[PDB]
Amino acid sequence: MISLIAALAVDRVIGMENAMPWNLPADLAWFKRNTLNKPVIMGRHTWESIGRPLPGRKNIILSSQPGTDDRVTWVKSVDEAIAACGDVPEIMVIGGGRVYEQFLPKAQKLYLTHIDAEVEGDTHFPDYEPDDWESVFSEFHDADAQNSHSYCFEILERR
Ligand SMILES: NC(=O)c1ccc[n+]([C@@H]2O[C@H](COP(=O)([O-])OP(=O)(O)OC[C@H]3O[C@@H](n4cnc5c(N)ncnc54)[C@H](OP(=O)(O)O)[C@@H]3O)[C@@H](O)[C@H]2O)c1
Ligand SMILES: Nc1nc(=O)c2nc(CNc3ccc(C(=O)N[C@@H](CCC(=O)O)C(=O)O)cc3)cnc2[nH]1
Ligand SMILES: [Mn+2]
Ligand SMILES: [Mn+2]
Ligand SMILES: [Mn+2]
């Protein structure tokens, strides 16, 4: 099974200048819980944005060019990325925009955080078709001293 996980600001913005400008510790904790002990697939730009391997997960990087770090696994196509995960119950696709576009048609589940924040971005989550997806979990949180925007955790499953 393939799942996508992402955090979206207003208008599906996910990034600006190869960074995420907000800071929501509760959402990063949600990301860790939902990805630990699973393989994670990311594009090369997102690898550079994170800047180090994510511990406790098999890190698989898509790039058309040879890899430059043997602490992670490098692959050259979507099918190779999936194969490199092996026989696991759930593969997590962790972006960025280009990678999400390619894996969305193959995904059964979306883990989306909707953040009540406006930021001028250059990368968006794919326009997906709402009719194709059932919301099976949603949990809203007001802003607090650690998290400066309100946010909603949602899990959707392909109908
Ligand atoms: N808010 C969130 O949830 C979230 C999550 C992830 C990322 N982000 C943000 O998203 C932005 C990065 O997204 P992005 O769309 O620019 O880049 P991306 O999807 O992370 O990386 C694109 C790169 O991946 C490689 N690639 C993708 N598909 C491939 C394929 N089929 N075969 C081979 N290589 C492939 C290519 O690398 P080569 O050029 O080396 O061939 C391509 O240039 C950053 O701002 C980041 O902070 C946000
Ligand atoms: N919901 C969601 N939020 C995100 O921030 C997110 N980020 C990415 C890509 N970028 C990043 C950037 C940093 C870390 C990171 O530092 N993660 C640590 C945090 C642990 C914690 O804060 O408790 C990790 O071990 O996962 C992960 C992904 C992909 N999907 C996402 N999905
Ligand atoms: Mn092929
Ligand atoms: Mn197999
Ligand atoms: Mn806000």
UniProtKB/Swiss-Prot annotation:
InterPro entries referenced in this protein's UniProt entry, alphabetically: DHFR (IPR012259), DHFR-like_dom_sf (IPR024072), DHFR_CS (IPR017925), DHFR_dom (IPR001796)
CDD domains: DHFR
UniProt GO BP: 10-formyltetrahydrofolate biosynthetic process; dihydrofolate metabolic process; folic acid biosynthetic process; folic acid metabolic process; one-carbon metabolic process; response to antibiotic; response to methotrexate; response to xenobiotic stimulus
Effect of M20L: Increases catalytic rate 2.5-fold. Increases catalytic rate about 7-fold
Catalyses which reaction(s): (6S)-5,6,7,8-tetrahydrofolate + NADP(+) = 7,8-dihydrofolate + NADPH + H(+)
Alphabetized GO MF terms: dihydrofolate reductase activity; dihydrofolic acid binding; folic acid binding; methotrexate binding; NADP binding; NADP+ binding; NADPH binding
EC number, as in UniProt: 1.5.1.3
Similarity section: Belongs to the dihydrofolate reductase family.
Function: Key enzyme in folate metabolism. Catalyzes an essential reaction for de novo glycine and purine synthesis, and for DNA precursor synthesis.
Name recorded for this polypeptide: Dihydrofolate reductase
Species: Escherichia coli (strain K12)
Gene transcribed to yield this protein: folA
